[PDB]
Design a protein around this ligand. Structure first.
Ligand SMILES: [Cl-]
Ligand SMILES: [Cl-]
Ligand SMILES: [Cl-]
Ligand SMILES: [Cl-]
Lengths: 123, 123, 123, 123
């Protein structure tokens, strides 16, 4: 699912995930968020299972964006954890954790959680 | 906190996180889990805020491991999302999401969540 | 949104959530899961904001099921945390945490996380 | 673990959880948060496994607080999902989800996630 994963994906919010899946298990690309303290593209890196099971299961993967680029720094990072599901309507189904840098006093409210589903057509 | 982050870290379970923080915001290294369907080291990649706030807040970061190496493939990936907190007892405080590849029928039980705290001395 | 919330709801998996919202903020009812180690109905209790904002925001709420009834005991409990969104296609959008009782050794893999969306018509 | 659970508990933040475990699986009590948009006590309700396994596993449980009382309304609800672990240093180890009521536009940032550990002595 190297060929399955590589390309341009869009989530439910209208964000754009541009990724290359390497033969070695690497994910590399850019992320553009349609929401939050973000503008333009951000570097992403991650990993995927380059030898998934052949029993109809999805392909596990994850990636990170730190929300610093040449335009903005939101002092925060999101990780998406999920699986790719191949087929006519391919999907990447994820859950995510968005941690902000905080003082120790505020650390209890550091981390947002949510879920994004990515498709190969805007959605 | 490039110099702060780079090095060897240990969590509460006795896992080993070996990371290099690049000037450009990259995290690269290896992870060895003391638990689960894992043996030896696994590639990791991630990102961190290379220009954190200077108001006493932590440094946001995240990374991914896909649990495939030359020994084992657990058809799963974990992402850690958290912040580095500098000082005498430096810490990386994370929450994580562990997604397994599943059938669509089993996707509701695909994802474990937990929390790991890393220190520079075993802990 | 007492009248909005009270009634029968269905999620994406085909589970059935039967709830009464009390004037005092209580949620009481039964839950029937279409998946997992479950059969028939389970007691639920929870709470909701009985005086939500009037600026178009949702109504925050949560509830718990312990997966013990007269038929089965899965030694586990789920909590749903979310918001009710009123209107023609009313919805309750949740994220959930499913904790199993474990030994200390296995506690790192105790907790599943996911997301359920409930509608007033099967869905 | 009815007798184990019933009583006064304290988390790492200095919050106070006062609970009664009923023979029927109910949890009822009050919660006082040391942080956030909160003052004084809030109603809680939840559920626990009233017939846990006898193999050394913990007792699964969960509860909800809606953050409305006679003093304040934060238009939000937290659910804690976790397990009770009996013994000399009894503990309840939880993960939590704090959902705020939001507009649809802001729903992606509705939910905080974290972890609380409760002990029978301040901690
Ligand atoms: Cl959804
Ligand atoms: Cl902990
Ligand atoms: Cl979804
Ligand atoms: Cl902790």
């Amino acid at each position: 699912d190297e060929a399955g994963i590589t390309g341009t994906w869009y989530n439910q919010l209208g964000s754009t995930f541009i990724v290359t899946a390497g033969a070695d298990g690497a994910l590399t690309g850019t992320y553009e968020s349609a929401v939050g303290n973000a503008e333009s593209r951000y570097v992403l890196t991650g990993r995927y299972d380059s030898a998934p099971a052949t029993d109809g299961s999805g392909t596990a993967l994850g990636w990170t964006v730190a929300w610093k680029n040449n335009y903005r720094n939101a002092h925060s990072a999101t990780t998406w954890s999920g699986q790719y599901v191949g087929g006519a309507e391919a999907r990447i189904n994820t859950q995510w954790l968005l941690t902000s840098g905080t003082t120790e006093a505020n650390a209890w409210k550091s981390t947002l959680v949510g879920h994004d589903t990515f498709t190969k057509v805007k959605p």
